[PDB]
Amino acid sequence: DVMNRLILAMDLMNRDDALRVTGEVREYIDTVKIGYPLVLSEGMDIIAEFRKRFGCRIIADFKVADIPETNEKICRATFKAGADAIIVHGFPGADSVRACLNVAEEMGREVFLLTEMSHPGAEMFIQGAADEIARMGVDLGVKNYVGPSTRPERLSRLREIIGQDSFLISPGAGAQGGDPGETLRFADAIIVGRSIYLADNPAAAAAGAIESIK
Amino acid sequence: DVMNRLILAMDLMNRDDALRVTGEVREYIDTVKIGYPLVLSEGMDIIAEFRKRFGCRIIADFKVADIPETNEKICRATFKAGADAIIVHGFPGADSVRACLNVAEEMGREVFLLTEMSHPGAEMFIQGAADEIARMGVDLGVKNYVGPSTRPERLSRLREIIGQDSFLISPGAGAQGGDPGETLRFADAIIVGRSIYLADNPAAAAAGAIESI
Numbered sequence: 345d346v347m348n349r350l351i352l353a354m355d356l357m358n359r360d361d362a363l364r365v366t367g368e369v370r371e372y373i374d375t376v377k378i379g380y381p382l383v384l385s386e387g388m389d390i391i392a393e394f395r396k397r398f399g400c401r402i403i404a405d406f407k408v409a410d411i412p413e414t415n416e417k418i419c420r421a422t423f424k425a426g427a428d429a430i431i432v433h434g435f436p437g438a439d440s441v442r443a444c445l446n447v448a449e450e451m452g453r454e455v456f457l458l459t460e461m462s463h464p465g466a467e468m469f470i471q472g473a474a475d476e477i478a479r480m481g482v483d484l485g486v487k488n489y490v491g492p493s494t495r496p497e498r499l500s501r502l503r504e505i506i507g508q509d510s511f512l513i514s515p516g517a518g519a520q521g522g523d524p525g526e527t528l529r530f531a532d533a534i535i536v537g538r539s540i541y542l543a544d545n546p547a548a549a550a551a552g553a554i555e556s557i558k
Numbered sequence: 559d560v561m562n563r564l565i566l567a568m569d570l571m572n573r574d575d576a577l578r579v580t581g582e583v584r585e586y587i588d589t590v591k592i593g594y595p596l597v598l599s600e601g602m603d604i605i606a607e608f609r610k611r612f613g614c615r616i617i618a619d620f621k622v623a624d625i626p627e628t629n630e631k632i633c634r635a636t637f638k639a640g641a642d643a644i645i646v647h648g649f650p651g652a653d654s655v656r657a658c659l660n661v662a663e664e665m666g667r668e669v670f671l672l673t674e675m676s677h678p679g680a681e682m683f684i685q686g687a688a689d690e691i692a693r694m695g696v697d698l699g700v701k702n703y704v705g706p707s708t709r710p711e712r713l714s715r716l717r718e719i720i721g722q723d724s725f726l727i728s729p730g731a732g733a734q735g736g737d738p739g740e741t742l743r744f745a746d747a748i749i750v751g752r753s754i755y756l757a758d759n760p761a762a763a764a765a766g767a768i769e770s771i
């Protein structure tokens with residue numbers, strides 16, 4: 345369970361701006377998604393910086409998509425840096441997912457399995473594999489999933505596959521055109537990035553998001 | 559064209575060991591693949607350190623696999639850090655690939671498109687998409703590709719799709735069981751990691767790999 349069903353996608357690329365904006369909306373969220381735009385710009389230490397400053401859960405959105413051996417290394421370094429969870433692509437297959445699950449279990453952290461993506465290009469290859477990727481996750485005991493706000497019927501199908509007990513978060517609301525309300529019919533929380541962090545008043549944008557799903 | 563058709567996959571996770579081992583084999587290679595194991599352990603500054611210390615080409619193996627907007631940011635940060643090239647997954651589709659191509663063109667760097675992967679799990683979803691992924695790359699003017707040493711007939715088919723002029727590099731030789739010689743029937747260079755960097759004598763391992771080819 346995530347505060348206000350709202351996860352901030354902090355994809356600003358310098359620490360001052362990222363910390364300032366996160367500080368502006370800190371009252372509205374307790375979970376922040378940090379990805380490569382911020383990490384590759386400021387270093388992995390930025391994760392510990394967020395956890396200390398905001399007391400928030402951090403999901404490391406690294407879309408892990410390598411062979412098992414390399415996946416293990418990526419997960420180890422990421423959890424060592426303090427991430428509570430890591431997002432892993434399902435498309436590379438079950439061995440690559442299991443590698444991540446092993447490290448997460450060892451270290452007491454979580455894996456989120458990325459099924460279908462929210463952007464148009466997801467239609468080409470990912471969409472056709474997505475139901476089976478979700479099922480693979482279920483079969484392996486994965487409990488956390490990511491699916492697209494921009495395709496409510498796909499999101500609904502993924503929820504059907506993973507069951508009511510699995511945790512499902514969903515990006516694509518706001519900038520990419522997804523609707524928070526519709527999305528939360530199926531997802532437990534929505535991921536929101538630009539529509540908050542590029543807003544003239546990010547606190548107002550966050551409050552507005554929450555208001556509309558009150 | 560890379561020196562000795564051999565690209566070092568430097569996946570050690572601390573600066574001292576990575577720099578030491580790369581130094582031991584610097585005579586045999588002019589191209590190093592640096593990925594997230596090293597970068598997430600030591601920081602993006604490690605790329606510039608490699609380029610200055612070894613004068614090598616650096617391929618940032620980041621398997622970029624996000625939406626276009628995020629892909630653009632990842633490529634910008636990566637090329638800003640000095641990477642000569644970046645490896646991008648094709649599975650997320652054409653828009654995600656074009657986002658990377660845009661930044662690469664802007665900054666005078668290269669994109670390598672990952673088609674099929676070398677590990678067993680690649681059978682599940684990637685293999686069935688790989689020919690079309692390769693074709694997508696061709697249609698977009700991609701000139702650099704990655705394909706698997708572990709599946710020579712797949713690698714051969716990928717070469718057929720991309721044509722003789724495209725540059726194809728291939729991981730999976732050594733630790734994963736691929737054969738350097740067979741692989742180089744189709745790929746322009748092999749990527750080698752553990753069989754060199756975990757070797758008791760990495761210089762001998764590199765020399766040996768080269769001698770066999």
Ligand SMILES: O=c1cc(O)n([C@@H]2O[C@H](COP(=O)(O)O)[C@@H](O)[C@H]2O)c(=O)[nH]1
Nearest residue numbers: 353460461462515519536537538624628
């Ligand atoms: O299917 C996917 C999976 C993601 O993690 N994401 C990501 O979630 C975020 C979306 O942010 P935004 O609200 O600005 O569109 C980004 O960090 C992005 O990389 C995506 O948009 N679609």
Ligand SMILES: O=c1cc(O)n([C@@H]2O[C@H](COP(=O)(O)O)[C@@H](O)[C@H]2O)c(=O)[nH]1
Nearest residue numbers: 411414567674675676729733750751752
């Ligand atoms: O299909 C793929 C694509 C890769 O980049 N790689 C990668 O290339 C390297 C292989 O190293 P090794 O020789 O130790 O198996 C690793 O860095 C790894 O992540 C892979 O092994 N198969």
